[PDB]
Amino acid sequence: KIEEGKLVIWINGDKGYNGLAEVGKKFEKDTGIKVTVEHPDKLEEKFPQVAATGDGPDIIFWAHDRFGGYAQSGLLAEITPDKAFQDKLYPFTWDAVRYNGKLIAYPIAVEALSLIYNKDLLPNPPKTWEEIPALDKELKAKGKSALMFNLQEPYFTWPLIAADGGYAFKYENGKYDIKDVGVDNAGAKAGLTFLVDLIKNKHMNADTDYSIAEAAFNKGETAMTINGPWAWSNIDTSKVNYGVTVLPTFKGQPSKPFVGVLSAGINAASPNKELAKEFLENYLLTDEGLEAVNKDKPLGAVALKSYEEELAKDPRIAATMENADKGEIMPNIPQMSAFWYAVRTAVINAASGRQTVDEALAAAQTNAAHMSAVVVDAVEHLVRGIVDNPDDVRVDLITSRRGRTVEVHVHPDD
Amino acid sequence: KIEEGKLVIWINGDKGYNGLAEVGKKFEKDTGIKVTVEHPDKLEEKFPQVAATGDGPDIIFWAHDRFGGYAQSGLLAEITPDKAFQDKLYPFTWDAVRYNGKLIAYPIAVEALSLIYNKDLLPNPPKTWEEIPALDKELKAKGKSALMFNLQEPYFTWPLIAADGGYAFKYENGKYDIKDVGVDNAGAKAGLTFLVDLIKNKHMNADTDYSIAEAAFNKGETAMTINGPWAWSNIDTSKVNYGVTVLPTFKGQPSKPFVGVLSAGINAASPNKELAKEFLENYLLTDEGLEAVNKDKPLGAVALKSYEEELAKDPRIAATMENADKGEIMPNIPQMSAFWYAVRTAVINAASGRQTVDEALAAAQTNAAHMSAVVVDAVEHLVRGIVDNPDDVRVDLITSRRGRTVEVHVHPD
C-alpha cells in the first residue's frame, strides 16, 4: 500500500537525478513531509499494474500520451487547481491533461518539432514550404540539398499535411469527437500533394528516414531538417553551426506539429492527494522550483508562463514553444493506434506512387475512423504472417458473412 | 509390438460387426491363423500415432483419402499383387491406392454421387442438365420442383462444374502436382454459369443445403436430388418410390463426381505382410469374401469385377459404379483443404451475385494453388474476428513489404 504522511515520486532518470529531489528538500524544510524521488525501470509499464492494486507512487511524471490510458482505468486522481493557478500555465497545456472533460494531471514541459537549419549554408532559412524547391535547385549546384527529414513516420510529415486543414480527431470545448476524422479533407490532400511533388521533382527521396536525415544534416550535406529538442546535443558535438526556428508555412498557414507535454499525475490510490497538490502547485510549478530542476537537466519549453519567458531567451526554446502553440496537442485516446497505422501506410503509398494522394488519404480516413486498436492488431498480425512467409503465398478472397464483406488480396508487387 | 503368427484388422463399425469377421473365421478355418477384427473409436486418427511407433493393426480399412498421408509418413507397406490379380479389379480403382507410383493398399469398394429421382413424379428422369429448366416449369404448375441438392458444399456442385472441363489437381503415377490446378478453365466457368442461371431463373434457391434438399425429396416436394448411397435408407423409410441413375450430362459430357474408394492398407511395421496379402487377395477380394461382408452391411459398388456384376443387378449400385467410372478419384493430398475452401467461397459468391462466375473461379484458382493450410487458417481466423465484431468495423488497407503486396478490406454488404 502507499504510506500516509510522505510523498513518493516516480520520474525517469533522464529528467534529473538531483533537480526534483532539491524541490523535495525545500518542501520537507517548510512542511516536515519527506519527498522521495525513485527511477524504477519501465515505470510507465510498472505504474498501471501497481496502481490498479492501490500501490505505486503518490506522483508519476510522464508524457501525457500515457495518461489517457491511466485516466481511463481510474488510476489518476482528478486535480482541483483554481483558475488562478491555471492562468499561471499556458491555456493549451491544460488540453493535454484533460480526459473526458476532467483535469487528471499538472502540465510541466512542452515539446515539439521545429525547423533546424545550418547557418553557414543558409543564414536566412525560408518562411514558406513553397520556396524550398527553388532553394534546393540552387543548393544542388553547390552539391547540397535544401531539406532532409524522416518521411517514413507520420509524426514528422503530419505538420505539413495539417497546415491547410488536416486533423486527426476534432478537438473542441475540451472534448475529442472520435467520429470527426480530418485525414481526407482538401487541406490534408493539398499538404500531402506538396510533399509528394517534393519527391517527384527530386527535392526529396521517399526513402529518407530519421537516421539518414540526421547523418545528412550533421555532416553539412543538407541545409535544413525537421526534428525535436532530443536531436540538439548530437548537432552540438557535430560542430555544424545550427539555428532552430518556426516551421515553414504552407498556403500562408503554419505547419502544425503534434505536441508532447511532460505531466505530473496524482495516484487515485494515494492517501496524500493534498500534500501532492501543495508540492506540485506551490513548490515545483514556480520559477524557484522549475529552476532547481532545469539547473540539473534542461526541461526545454515549460508550461509555466513566468519561467518560459526566462527560458525563451534561448531562441531554440522560443522556437519549440511557438511551433507547439501553433501545433496540435497529440490526442491521448485509444483511436490514435488507428490514426498512426492508417497515415503511416497512406504517406508511404503516396510517396512511392502505389496510391494517388486521394486514394491513400480516403483509405486512411476510413481506417482512422473505424479501426479499433484490437482490429489494427488483428490486421497487422495477418499481414506479418503473410509478408514474412518465404513460400509463393497468393490470395484473392471475398467472403460476406453476417451483413459484413471481407476481402483479402496477396500478390507480388507492380 | 504387433504380434507375429496372427492378424489384427481395424475397420469402422459401420462396415459391419460380423461381415469381415466371417471372412476372418474362414481364413482361420483354412490356415489355423487367428484373425481379430477390431473397431476402435477414431481409428483413422489412432492408426497414424500407433503405427509411427511400430504398433497398431496388421491391416487398416478406410477411404483412400487418408492413405496418402499414411503413405507419406511411410506407415503403409508396398503391396505386391501380380498383373493377374490387378486385372480382377477395375483399372481406375488402382489409381486411388498409388503413392509416388507405388501401390500402398487394395481397393475394396467405390462410392460416388448419383441422380436420385421420384418415379411417381418423374418415371423418365432427364439425361441432360439442359432439359431441367423446362422440366421445372412443368412440375412448378403441379406445385413441385425438378431438382434440389446441397449448393453450399463443393462436393455436390463440382460434378456439373467439371463436366465440360475442370479438375482439382493433376495426377500422374501416384502423384498429384500441387501447382497444376484446373479450377478456372472455360469448362468450369460454363458449368458454374449453368448452375448460377438455374438460381437466377428460380429453378433452384442459392440457400438450398443438404438437410433442405433431403427434406424436399423425402416429402415428395422435388422430383430429383443428387446424393450418395449413405442417403438411400432414409428414402426407403420415406413415402417415396425412388430410382438411382446416371447423373445428367452437360454439353453432351457426363457429370464428374469425386470418387471415394474404401481400401485395405498393410501396416509397414506388420511382421505378417504375407499373411495379410493371402487374406486380402484370396479370401476377402473374392465373390465369397465380399458376399460375407455385403450381407452384413452393403459395400455399394465394389472394385472386384466378378462381384460388381452381381451387385449391379441392383440398378442403384449399377448407377453408383457408372457415375464413379465417369467421375474423378478424390485427391488424397493435404492441399484438398485449399481446394474446398477456394471453391466453396467461389460458388457461394457466384450463386449470391457477389462475384461474376469468371472473377469467382479466377480467384478460386489463385487460392487453391497458392494458399497453404496455415495461410487459410490465418485468413479465416481474421475473418471470424472481424465478422463477429458488433461495432461498425471498416478497413481499406493496401501495404507492400519485402516484394509482397497485401490488401485487406472490411465494409457492409
Curated annotation (Swiss-Prot), chain B:
Predominant localisation class: periplasm
Keyword Iron among UniProt keywords: no
Subcellular location: Periplasm
GO CC annotations, alphabetized: ATP-binding cassette (ABC) transporter complex; ATP-binding cassette (ABC) transporter complex, substrate-binding subunit-containing; maltose transport complex; membrane; outer membrane-bounded periplasmic space; periplasmic space
Keywords from the UniProt entry: Periplasm, Signal, Sugar transport, Transport
One of the GO biological process terms: carbohydrate transport
InterPro entries in UniProt: Maltose/Cyclodextrin-bd, SBP, SBP_1_CS
Family: Belongs to the bacterial solute-binding protein 1 family.
Function summary: Part of the ABC transporter complex MalEFGK involved in maltose/maltodextrin import. Binds maltose and higher maltodextrins such as maltotriose.
Subunit architecture: The complex is composed of two ATP-binding proteins (MalK), two transmembrane proteins (MalG and MalF) and a solute-binding protein (MalE).
Name of the molecule in the record: Maltose/maltodextrin-binding periplasmic protein
